[PDB]
Design a protein around this ligand. Structure first.
Ligand SMILES: CCNC(=O)c1cc2c(N[C@H](c3ccc4c(c3)S(=O)(=O)NCC4)C(C)C)ncnc2[nH]1
Length: 168
């Protein structure tokens, strides 16, 4: 199904909408919803916290089982877990947290994980508390992702700046 609506096509494979990813996931129930995760899969605040709260903590208990059995992810890495009631799968992806000294070169490695799935609903990696420049994150996405990605950005002001900079 992947019934995405109201998106603006930026490139052949990148679409963008001013929307809350949790709300989009509920309506669309996409095959894959991306989580802006940390290496230990602790979904305490922001986007990760909101996705986890929408599953009524079922994603946190699953992530905890994953970590105990497989160990933490590396910055730029990912893992595929259940999407619970939000999606068929959740692709947890760790972008660099530049506010904590992590390499911005790893933002390319993080978006590369998207290429293992045909269609994904995702947030802007490394934006918000992670400290990366959001327009730079969208540029890395556009150059790196080759599969079909629907980006939800929950801030009209930021959405407008992104669309203006892209001029598309
Ligand atoms: C009301 C429930 N939903 C939310 O809180 C929510 C928030 C939200 C959202 N926020 C964006 C965003 C993008 C990436 C990151 C963050 C925040 S963070 O939480 O600071 N962690 C680092 C990675 C900002 C830039 C506008 N984007 C898309 N959908 C959303 N939904």
């Amino acid at each position: 199904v992947n019934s995405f609506s109201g998106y603006l096509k930026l490139t052949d494979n990148v679409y963008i909408k001013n929307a809350d990813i949790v709300e989009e996931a509920k309506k669309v129930k996409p095959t894959v919803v991306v989580n802006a995760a940390n290496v230990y899969l602790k979904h305490g605040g922001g986007v990760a916290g909101a996705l986890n709260k929408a599953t009524n903590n079922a994603m946190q208990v699953e992530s905890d089982d994953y970590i105990a059995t497989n160990g933490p992810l590396k910055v730029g890495g990912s893992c595929v877990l259940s999407g619970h009631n939000l999606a068929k799968h959740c692709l947890h992806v760790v972008g660099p947290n530049v506010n904590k000294g992590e390499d911005i070169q790893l933002l390319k490695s993080a978006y590369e994980n998207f290429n293992q799935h045909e269609v994904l609903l995702a947030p802007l990696l490394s934006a918000g508390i992670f400290g990366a420049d959001p327009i730079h994150s969208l540029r890395v996405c556009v150059d790196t992702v080759r599969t079909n990605v629907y980006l939800a950005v929950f801030d009209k002001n930021l959405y407008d700046k992104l669309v203006s900079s892209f001029l598309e």
